[PDB]
Amino acid sequence: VSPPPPIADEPLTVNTGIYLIECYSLDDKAETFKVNAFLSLSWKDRRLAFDPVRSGVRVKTYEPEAIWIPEIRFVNVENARDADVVDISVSPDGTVQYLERFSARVLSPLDFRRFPFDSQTLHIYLIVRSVDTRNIVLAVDLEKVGKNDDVFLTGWDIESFTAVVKPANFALEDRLESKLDYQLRISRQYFSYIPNIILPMLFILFISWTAFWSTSYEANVTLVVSTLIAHIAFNILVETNLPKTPYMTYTGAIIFMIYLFYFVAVIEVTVQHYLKVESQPARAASITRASRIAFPVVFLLANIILAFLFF
Amino acid sequence: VSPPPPIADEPLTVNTGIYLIECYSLDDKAETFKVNAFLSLSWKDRRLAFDPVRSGVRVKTYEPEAIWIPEIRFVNVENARDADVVDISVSPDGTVQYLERFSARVLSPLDFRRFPFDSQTLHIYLIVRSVDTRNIVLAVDLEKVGKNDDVFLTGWDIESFTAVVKPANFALEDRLESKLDYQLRISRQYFSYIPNIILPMLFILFISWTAFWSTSYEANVTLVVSTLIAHIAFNILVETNLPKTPYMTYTGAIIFMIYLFYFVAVIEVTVQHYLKVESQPARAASITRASRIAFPVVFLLANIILAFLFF
Amino acid sequence: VSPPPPIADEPLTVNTGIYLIECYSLDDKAETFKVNAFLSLSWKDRRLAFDPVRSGVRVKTYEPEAIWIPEIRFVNVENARDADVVDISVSPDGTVQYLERFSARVLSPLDFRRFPFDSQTLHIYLIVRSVDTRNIVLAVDLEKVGKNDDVFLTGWDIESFTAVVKPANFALEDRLESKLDYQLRISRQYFSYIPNIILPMLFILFISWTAFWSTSYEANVTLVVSTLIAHIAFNILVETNLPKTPYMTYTGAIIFMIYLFYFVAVIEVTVQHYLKVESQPARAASITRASRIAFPVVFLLANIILAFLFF
Amino acid sequence: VSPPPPIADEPLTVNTGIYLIECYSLDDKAETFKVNAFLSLSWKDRRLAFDPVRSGVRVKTYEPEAIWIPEIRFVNVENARDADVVDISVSPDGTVQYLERFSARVLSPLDFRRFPFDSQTLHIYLIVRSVDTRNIVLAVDLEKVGKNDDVFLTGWDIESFTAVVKPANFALEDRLESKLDYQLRISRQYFSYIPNIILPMLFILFISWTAFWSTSYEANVTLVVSTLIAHIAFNILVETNLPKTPYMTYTGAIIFMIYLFYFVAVIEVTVQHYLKVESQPARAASITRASRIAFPVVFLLANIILAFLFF
Amino acid sequence: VSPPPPIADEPLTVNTGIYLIECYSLDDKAETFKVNAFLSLSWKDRRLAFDPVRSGVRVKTYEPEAIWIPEIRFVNVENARDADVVDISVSPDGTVQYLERFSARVLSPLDFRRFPFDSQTLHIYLIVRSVDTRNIVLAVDLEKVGKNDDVFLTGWDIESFTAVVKPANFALEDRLESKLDYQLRISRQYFSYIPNIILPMLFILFISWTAFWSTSYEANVTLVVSTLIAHIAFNILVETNLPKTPYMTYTGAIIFMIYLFYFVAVIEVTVQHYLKVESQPARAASITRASRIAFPVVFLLANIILAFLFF
Ligand SMILES: [Cl-]
Ligand SMILES: [Cl-]
Ligand SMILES: [Cl-]
Ligand SMILES: [Cl-]
Ligand SMILES: [Cl-]
Ligand SMILES: [Cl-]
Ligand SMILES: [Cl-]
Ligand code: NA
Ligand code: NA
Ligand code: NA
Ligand code: NA
Ligand code: NA
Ligand code: NA
């Protein structure tokens, strides 16, 4: 079967729509999400026109093999979508209404700069390649673009699902390609990060600072080194959940900065001990008293500077 | 093949039933479960009616290709169910009795608030889309809804498998959809959490409190910081098994609260030492004696408050 | 094709056999194992009978599509078995000899109570559903039930592969079902658990008890808390390899009991220190001397009690 | 299509060959490897014979459906091989030359006794089942057995790929089976184990022995217990990479033996302290001086004994 | 269908091109990457030639079954590529222009020597096997070799995608094979390794060196042993992300070298203590003062030596 012939020199318009049924498995590391949706296609094929009196039916149902169907593909998928045709309906003028239900693993990059307070725009790019006989162009039928109310993405808030109505038409290997951009806007549910990572990490840091109210070097060494180890554990935990980014993330910056605080606390604890042994505890006392104020103040100001730079 | 024609303007009733054979792989993180069941479908097709006297046979068996079969789909599945038709039987009045055996990975959200003392209602939504010639409506045939006695879900108690008999009929892309809700009620087997997480976690906490019967700062620092590290290990273990929720879970609340107890024990241990060095051990002794009662009492009361808020 | 017609009102006997070729991937957590075997089926179809003199041939070979083959399914599989027909041979009396080679992921529960000294009975349930024309019943041909000598299940000793010759005939959705139970008896190779978990766990426990030959509280605290942490690591390791059971396992019981020993050693270490500070080292010395005998004796007796209850 | 008929009572010889293209994913735990290779089959079918003069062609090309092809299977595969026929060529005498390219996950057991200085013989068993009309026997065409030069198995040195030319002919379910053994000999690249596990493990052990040059019990306890914990980490790491064996592995033996050294160092550290407190430091000094020589000497000799028993 | 017949004794040239659409999942451990691309094939088939005047059409479109298509395969793939034909266009001279969209998991070895500052050349080898009638040779059409601008490989910078225009023609099982090498040059994004592994590792090492400004053996032992344990954690982390190489990697060398520094710091800390106890603190003081300079100087020089040898 060949494509529909034109009335003039006009391209064939395939009206599209995606209606999300299921949204799942947003893998932060892989920068992928799985979708289960309806793909709706509509175009005119005057060769399929018919008389309702003669045929008996007001609308004819065809099997995909029986008629010409445009080869619509997803750009940013891992493998070809698993699709099952739901219906193909032809009206007397030859207007075809195609519907399939598909599932696909979409590959859409994520911006981790503001993690875990980041928002993303996930993309689903629809594409059609023009044939030699006719040029095929994609369109968005907004009445056929939407999402189910129950659509839930674990750890994410689904904001909107809209399509950029004007396709990106371009040449690829001496043939026209019509590409549509469906955008799923989401924002991360940061809640859990507060009791699971952020607050535990702050508590261990604050525990290290109790060494500023102790003259016991042996005890101080234990306090700062132990909490440092707990921080390393949280750092490894965070980096196992996130991909390796060529930029600094907000959590990354905070986690890294905290190492410097542990490093300087070790210096302070060492300096204080050196002085006590050198029979200069008056000088050591001045440093320890200053550290009690300096450490929380510098920590608070640095965090303000970071939150400012990132948000 | 086209759908059965109506006597009046009545919709076509497809009587349904799901009989669970196998229930497995309830992934808490993915909020998915795998099912292996029988799907039973039954509708009247007057075109398939026959006289038992003339034909000789009491029932006719057809192959799926030979007759019209409604396109029944599951809403909350990852991919289309893997199905194998078991039997298609037509009675003289044209009543078709379809049976298939399927397997599918169902995506049904879980409420982790009361974890590990939580119960869930897993859902399996059946759906049919109406055609242009006729409107299709789903029904529940309760004699064909059930589960095998051997049906076991590791770490879960299967309470009931029932269907909400009245379908949710609604319009989707200018066509009627008939959706049925099959509910599998389960309750978690909390037993293992007691010796594996809860009691180990309480033991390490109680070990930290022995610092209230010690004047040795160096030993105290070791007791409280080491047990804190063991608690961090249990916290990381628990959060690796559970998904990130936008709410607090019972275990989450307890685990988080315990951090505060470690933080205050570090303060007490620091205060006691500071006073001893300041030659005020009488004041330190009052605080340490109070802490011996205060810590277990506040721990017990806080836990009562939490259990109350959560149950 | 319809099933063979009966001579009287007798059911159709499908003689079965499973010959295991490959046994692999016994997942303790998933309670699943993968199998690769031969499935042999044999039944009489009088319609396929022939005279060896007239036809010339002693046996006729058919393609699965040409003749009626009973729809034999596995009950306890994740998905339908991947099968490939090897041969279909018809004898002059119409006796069909079917052979296929299949692979399937079998879901059979495990009893972890005696772990890692546990034995299991893995099941492979064969099933046939009766048709309206005839009732189908399964039988075991013991000459066609067996296993390859090379059949190895990593970390398990394959004891026997036998079938319960009398099928469990029952009604399911107003039709007769004939179910056969093939049992694969295995026993765990406990060897590795001794040098990898059991002995390391005992060594760390015995190291904690050296605190009974030390008056140094700071050193004692280090001994008991450090070894406790190593025990936690072994506990987490064991619980990551096993599923969550609503009962206590042997290893689980031992691991849990050892926590109590660590808890009481911390109490002893605390009591001894408190007394030394209170200028009562004579009383402390009595307790420490008693603990040296009490701890190993109570440990040995408790273990005897546990091994008794579990075996 | 039926198999070729015999001239006498001779069996049909199917000449085989496997040419490895790709070798990957040798899973030590699963005892599996993935292969991508050419399978070549050759047999005489007199029915396909032709005169090159009359026909004009020197060779005829057939599609698999057109002619009889022997059902060749792999014994030790998880699932049936994914195969794609490359060519089927018939010579005038009726000699068929079949070639397919396949990929399969082969299940071949590993001997971990000498790990990580072990060598393995991976097997690929080819098999053919005899039909009722004729008995089929396999043969090895050595000009069609080989491997690509680029064939690389990460962390392994591919030594040889050869076939045991004489098949193992035997009866299975009253039919002859012809089994061929293709052996892929490999040897592990032990290099990485030296800087990643072996040397780190020895360094931590040697650090524990510095306690023999210290009278500080508190410091000694820290040295021996901390290094013991690092050893536990390496033990867990090693056992996560290897399967549970019913025998001792070389690395397993060394790792286990080292626990005894830590246990005896704790005893020495305890004994030395007990004596110092008992005002017998002269006796303690003799034991500590002896331990300085005894520990490395016994460690060296024990290792010689182990290497001897294992190699 | 047979291949095109030659004009002389010339081989058939199949002009090829790969246009990368999607690049993902570069597994460092597996040494694999997944690709989604266009495969373009072009060859002359004189049998398909037509007159544009007589036929009316400028180009004829065929279905893959209708015409002869060369069996083009990928050498270094796990399984056969998942492919979907996009278009087949024949020009009047019989020039066929084939286009398919495929996805494949490519197995291409990586050189980890300079990790994480390494660059790789990923390969995609195209291959065609010659038939008996004609010899098939591959060519590169450079106008049909390229990549999408959006092509992103997480943690990698895509440098170039080019083809080695001259194929590697060779004999394999007495038939000519024409192999083309498509090279995708990439370079790792080392950024993240600096704050995640490199700097944390240096900080813990520098913390160990504060023991050179302490006379407290107990505190020193804690400093050096604790930081050593944190280093072990980073070593295990790094080796879990990388495959086992028969050579030293840059990171591997640095990580290993740092163990020696910890070992020598333990010796220094032990020597200093031994001397203090022997009433020789003057000699101990000389060693500790030297170590303060020696350790950073030897560390800096050793690192210069390593960076030199590796880059
Ligand atoms: Cl697609
Ligand atoms: Cl479905
Ligand atoms: Cl099955
Ligand atoms: Cl196979
Ligand atoms: Cl391929
Ligand atoms: Cl050659
Ligand atoms: Cl050739
Ligand atoms: Na079509
Ligand atoms: Na149908
Ligand atoms: Na059949
Ligand atoms: Na065939
Ligand atoms: Na073709
Ligand atoms: Na310590």
XYZ file of C-alpha atoms in Angstrom, chain D:
311
model
C 9.742 -33.227 5.104
C 11.171 -36.546 6.404
C 14.926 -37.264 7.041
C 17.258 -38.668 4.296
C 16.822 -42.434 3.732
C 19.848 -44.734 4.319
C 21.819 -46.698 1.672
C 22.248 -49.602 4.208
C 21.471 -49.608 7.995
C 24.000 -46.738 8.577
C 23.165 -43.695 10.785
C 23.038 -40.120 9.415
C 26.235 -38.122 10.201
C 25.708 -34.411 10.868
C 29.122 -32.747 10.735
C 29.254 -29.808 13.162
C 31.350 -26.742 13.930
C 31.167 -23.747 16.303
C 33.196 -20.588 15.475
C 33.079 -18.107 18.403
C 32.517 -14.516 17.330
C 31.823 -12.945 20.760
C 32.468 -14.182 24.327
C 31.087 -12.144 27.200
C 29.412 -11.952 30.642
C 31.148 -14.805 32.546
C 29.118 -14.581 35.806
C 31.208 -16.310 38.562
C 28.182 -16.497 40.989
C 25.736 -17.830 38.302
C 28.437 -20.065 36.727
C 27.211 -18.873 33.280
C 28.777 -17.213 30.183
C 27.170 -15.665 27.102
C 28.365 -16.676 23.622
C 27.736 -15.321 20.075
C 28.974 -17.768 17.450
C 28.521 -19.494 14.086
C 26.984 -22.973 14.106
C 27.812 -24.923 10.984
C 25.943 -28.149 10.032
C 26.642 -30.517 7.097
C 24.941 -33.754 5.996
C 24.199 -35.689 2.776
C 20.604 -35.696 1.481
C 20.595 -37.898 -1.724
C 17.051 -36.546 -2.506
C 18.652 -33.094 -3.104
C 21.370 -34.433 -5.508
C 21.521 -32.927 -9.041
C 23.566 -33.005 -12.273
C 25.642 -29.759 -12.609
C 25.560 -30.091 -16.468
C 21.683 -30.450 -16.744
C 20.830 -27.876 -13.997
C 23.574 -25.441 -15.080
C 24.323 -24.438 -11.435
C 27.334 -25.757 -9.414
C 25.409 -25.273 -6.102
C 21.729 -24.741 -5.195
C 20.637 -22.423 -2.337
C 17.512 -23.430 -0.317
C 15.410 -21.711 2.364
C 15.172 -23.677 5.703
C 11.430 -24.484 5.074
C 12.169 -26.039 1.648
C 14.448 -28.855 2.926
C 14.890 -31.233 5.925
C 17.209 -29.808 8.629
C 18.296 -31.846 11.739
C 16.977 -30.555 15.090
C 20.337 -29.743 16.785
C 20.054 -28.388 20.359
C 22.419 -27.231 23.096
C 22.299 -29.220 26.305
C 23.676 -26.689 28.825
C 21.775 -23.525 27.819
C 19.306 -21.545 29.950
C 16.828 -21.037 27.066
C 16.837 -22.106 23.427
C 19.535 -20.213 21.442
C 18.473 -17.101 19.469
C 19.420 -18.229 15.904
C 19.419 -16.659 12.429
C 20.188 -18.807 9.350
C 23.022 -17.283 7.278
C 23.185 -19.824 4.401
C 22.028 -23.273 3.192
C 24.066 -24.575 0.190
C 23.574 -27.934 -1.621
C 26.374 -29.488 -3.719
C 25.567 -31.872 -6.694
C 25.968 -35.062 -4.530
C 23.278 -33.663 -2.188
C 25.766 -32.478 0.486
C 24.017 -29.740 2.480
C 26.073 -26.950 4.071
C 24.025 -25.125 6.706
C 25.270 -22.054 8.608
C 23.511 -20.036 11.312
C 24.619 -17.347 13.684
C 23.418 -17.783 17.265
C 23.671 -16.303 20.748
C 23.103 -18.324 23.940
C 23.656 -18.127 27.744
C 25.635 -21.275 28.555
C 25.546 -22.820 32.011
C 28.884 -24.426 32.768
C 30.152 -25.069 36.365
C 33.304 -23.459 37.766
C 35.980 -24.841 40.161
C 36.840 -22.071 42.610
C 39.416 -24.068 44.688
C 42.462 -22.151 43.364
C 40.685 -18.700 43.199
C 41.889 -16.147 42.037
C 44.670 -18.302 40.392
C 42.094 -20.730 38.849
C 41.614 -21.976 35.302
C 38.370 -23.320 33.900
C 37.124 -25.529 31.075
C 33.850 -24.068 29.871
C 31.628 -26.542 27.936
C 29.150 -26.177 25.078
C 27.362 -29.506 24.527
C 25.718 -30.029 21.128
C 23.034 -32.717 20.882
C 20.768 -34.429 18.282
C 17.887 -36.801 18.997
C 17.379 -39.764 16.614
C 14.078 -40.013 14.743
C 11.999 -43.171 14.240
C 12.978 -43.577 10.532
C 16.737 -42.909 11.075
C 19.419 -42.669 13.783
C 21.366 -39.366 13.817
C 25.015 -39.167 14.943
C 27.108 -35.950 15.319
C 30.651 -35.387 14.072
C 33.215 -32.572 14.365
C 34.515 -30.876 11.189
C 37.703 -29.320 12.657
C 37.963 -26.785 9.754
C 34.756 -25.290 11.002
C 35.775 -25.088 14.740
C 37.528 -21.901 15.869
C 37.321 -18.427 17.440
C 37.774 -14.777 16.406
C 41.141 -13.165 17.426
C 39.244 -10.183 19.024
C 37.303 -12.693 21.350
C 37.920 -11.185 24.820
C 36.395 -12.255 28.120
C 36.878 -9.434 30.696
C 39.203 -10.669 33.500
C 39.993 -13.963 31.708
C 42.670 -15.250 29.291
C 41.165 -17.427 26.523
C 43.576 -20.373 26.125
C 41.886 -22.712 23.575
C 38.545 -23.683 21.913
C 38.547 -27.324 20.857
C 35.995 -30.124 20.402
C 36.108 -33.717 21.686
C 35.718 -35.311 18.195
C 34.104 -38.590 19.446
C 30.433 -37.967 20.423
C 28.835 -39.457 23.520
C 26.079 -41.661 21.984
C 23.482 -42.867 24.551
C 19.800 -43.725 24.990
C 17.382 -41.191 26.455
C 13.635 -42.060 26.634
C 14.044 -45.051 24.261
C 15.798 -42.951 21.498
C 19.457 -42.442 20.619
C 21.078 -39.093 21.479
C 24.442 -37.956 19.977
C 26.197 -35.433 22.226
C 29.366 -33.399 21.319
C 31.616 -31.587 23.853
C 33.079 -28.204 22.780
C 35.619 -27.020 25.395
C 36.640 -23.403 25.907
C 39.738 -23.336 28.183
C 40.263 -20.102 30.104
C 42.488 -18.882 32.988
C 41.697 -15.994 35.339
C 43.633 -12.717 35.234
C 44.674 -12.647 38.942
C 46.650 -9.330 38.586
C 43.931 -7.002 40.037
C 43.396 -9.173 43.155
C 46.930 -8.368 44.349
C 46.482 -4.505 44.735
C 42.693 -4.656 45.403
C 42.297 -7.423 48.052
C 45.506 -9.416 48.836
C 47.917 -6.549 49.676
C 45.265 -4.322 51.503
C 44.398 -7.405 53.622
C 48.099 -8.059 54.470
C 48.715 -4.358 55.312
C 45.827 -4.264 57.822
C 47.129 -7.569 59.353
C 50.685 -6.148 59.678
C 49.247 -2.959 61.275
C 47.581 -5.213 63.946
C 51.071 -6.655 64.790
C 52.430 -3.163 65.783
C 50.553 -3.917 69.100
C 53.567 -6.194 69.873
C 55.675 -2.956 70.170
C 53.157 -1.259 72.525
C 52.444 -1.579 76.280
C 49.286 0.621 75.865
C 46.326 -1.849 76.201
C 43.769 0.822 75.144
C 45.828 1.541 71.953
C 46.428 -2.217 71.301
C 42.682 -3.052 71.618
C 42.006 -0.232 69.044
C 44.744 -1.534 66.666
C 43.629 -5.221 66.692
C 39.828 -4.672 66.764
C 39.875 -1.943 64.040
C 42.034 -3.985 61.634
C 39.796 -7.046 62.403
C 36.786 -4.945 61.261
C 38.650 -3.954 57.988
C 39.354 -7.708 57.464
C 35.592 -8.474 57.943
C 34.869 -5.835 55.207
C 37.280 -7.591 52.791
C 35.798 -11.029 53.715
C 32.222 -9.744 52.975
C 33.500 -8.147 49.701
C 35.108 -11.442 48.566
C 32.076 -13.562 49.520
C 29.675 -11.171 47.643
C 31.737 -11.791 44.365
C 31.909 -15.645 44.735
C 29.228 -18.394 44.892
C 28.750 -20.563 48.013
C 31.045 -23.596 47.440
C 30.840 -26.950 49.328
C 34.673 -26.802 49.547
C 37.285 -24.338 50.710
C 38.739 -21.913 48.140
C 42.344 -20.688 48.351
C 41.276 -17.064 49.162
C 38.625 -18.466 51.532
C 41.278 -20.467 53.449
C 43.653 -17.439 53.740
C 40.806 -15.059 54.750
C 39.578 -17.614 57.392
C 43.107 -18.328 58.724
C 43.690 -14.582 59.228
C 40.683 -14.518 61.674
C 42.654 -16.946 63.926
C 45.653 -14.561 63.854
C 43.399 -11.674 65.010
C 41.878 -13.912 67.704
C 45.333 -14.939 69.039
C 46.587 -11.256 68.855
C 43.570 -10.267 71.059
C 44.567 -13.103 73.505
C 48.242 -11.845 73.505
C 47.145 -8.183 74.039
C 44.803 -9.364 76.953
C 47.487 -11.648 78.564
C 50.138 -8.840 78.403
C 47.687 -6.368 80.092
C 46.551 -8.890 82.794
C 50.249 -9.510 83.727
C 51.097 -5.752 83.828
C 48.118 -5.161 86.221
C 49.235 -8.271 88.319
C 52.678 -6.507 88.610
C 54.360 -9.215 86.468
C 55.599 -7.044 83.478
C 58.763 -9.167 83.145
C 56.634 -12.217 82.127
C 54.419 -10.033 79.852
C 57.595 -8.671 78.186
C 58.796 -12.251 77.385
C 55.435 -13.103 75.717
C 55.345 -9.775 73.737
C 58.969 -10.287 72.559
C 58.156 -13.899 71.444
C 54.938 -12.752 69.654
C 57.028 -10.284 67.546
C 58.799 -13.332 65.933
C 56.107 -16.060 66.411
C 53.257 -14.183 64.556
C 55.142 -13.467 61.232
C 56.935 -16.915 61.293
C 53.682 -18.906 61.944
C 51.904 -16.697 59.332
C 54.641 -17.399 56.713
C 54.798 -21.163 57.441
C 50.968 -21.565 57.500
C 50.763 -19.771 54.103
C 53.464 -22.126 52.678
C 51.396 -25.111 54.006
C 48.194 -23.659 52.386
C 49.845 -22.838 48.990
C 51.280 -26.358 49.051
C 47.846 -27.995 49.732
C 46.138 -25.876 47.070
C 48.814 -25.889 44.255
